[PDB]
Structure 1
């Protein structure tokens, strides 16, 4: 229990599930946005060529 107080994270079960869900959807959103950025950049490069 002292180690638990040391780590200092509430880590509630409901909080755990919610947090993992939100951060994972953030991860996928980031990846998709980066892919969109790459696609648009390639389109612009094609336009220049």
Structure 2
């Protein structure tokens, strides 16, 4: 169970990092285009 749990959590961490990066760039696009 330990191995499966750590694998799932690691995948989720990586996905979350990607999500934060995506949000930042799309936030910049939104602000610039709206202005």
TM-score (norm 2): 0.80
CA RMSD of aligned residues (A): 1.0
Q: What runs of 5+ residues in structure 2 fail to find an aligned partner?
A: none
Task: Tell me if 1:30 matches 2:20.
Answer: no
Q: TM-score if structure 1 supplies the norm length? A: 0.62
Indicate the structure with greater helix content: 2
Measured after TM superposition, the shift of residue 48 of structure 1 is 3.1
Q: Give the gaps of 5 or more residues in structure 1.
A: 1-14
1:45 aligns with 2:31: yes
**C-alpha separation between the residues in 2 aligned to 1:48 and 1:22?**
38
